[PDB]
Amino acid sequence: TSTTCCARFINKKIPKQRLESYRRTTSSHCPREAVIFKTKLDKEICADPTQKWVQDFMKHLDKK
Amino acid sequence: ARCACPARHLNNTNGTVLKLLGCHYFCNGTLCTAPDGYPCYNLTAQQVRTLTTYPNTSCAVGVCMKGTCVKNGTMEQCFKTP
C-alpha cells in the first residue's frame, strides 16, 4: 500500500505540450484522490482525476 | 501551485485514510503547508523518535489548521512505509 499522497491539487489545466509521459495514481487510501503527472521541467504535479482535462490526458497517454 | 506535489503520509492498522505527519511537507523544492481540514497525526517528540515500520504507540489523530495538527481525540496505530 503506497503511502505517497497529494495534499493539494494544481488549480488550472496544464497544456499537454508542458507535460511528460509520467503518471502514477495515488492510493485510494489517500485523503484526496489524485493522479501524479510531471512537467517537462521535471516538477511532479498533483491532479484531480475528476476534472476532464486530467481524464483527457490520461487517455492521450494510453493512446500513445 | 508549487505545493501541488506528492508527500509521504503515515499508514495505520485501523482501516482509515492515510494521514500527514504534522501539517507541513517539502516537495518541488518548496516547504508547504497542508490545507485546513487535512487529516494529520500529531506525534510527541518522543513518539517521533521511535516512529518505525510497525505500530508501537497510540497516535493522536488531528486536523490541520494554519499549520497546526489539532488533535480530535481519536487515536490510531500509525506507522511509516518506505
SS3 content of chain B, % helix, strand, coil (to 5): 5, 50, 45
Structure-determination technique? X-ray
**What gap in Å lies between CA A17 and CA B30, rounded to an integer?**
24
Closest CB from B1, B32, B34 relative to A11: B1
Contact A24, A18 (CB under 8 A): no
Q: Print the domain residue range for B16.
A: 1-82
State residue B43 phi and psi, 5-degree precision. Answer: -100, 145
Q: Is A56 on the interface with B (CB under 8 A)?
A: no
SS3 category, A59:
helix
Is residue B72 within a helix (H) or strand (E), and if so which, with residue range?
A: strand B68-76
Resolution given for this structure, in angstroms: 2.1
For residues B55-78, b (16+ Cβ closer than 10 Å) or e, as one string? Answer: bebebbbbbbeeeebeeeeeebeb
Q: Where are the domains of chain A?
A: 1-64
Interface of A with B in 9-48 (CB under 8 A): 9-11, 26-27, 29-31, 34, 36, 43-47
**What gap in Å lies between CA B79 and CA B34, rounded to an integer?**
20
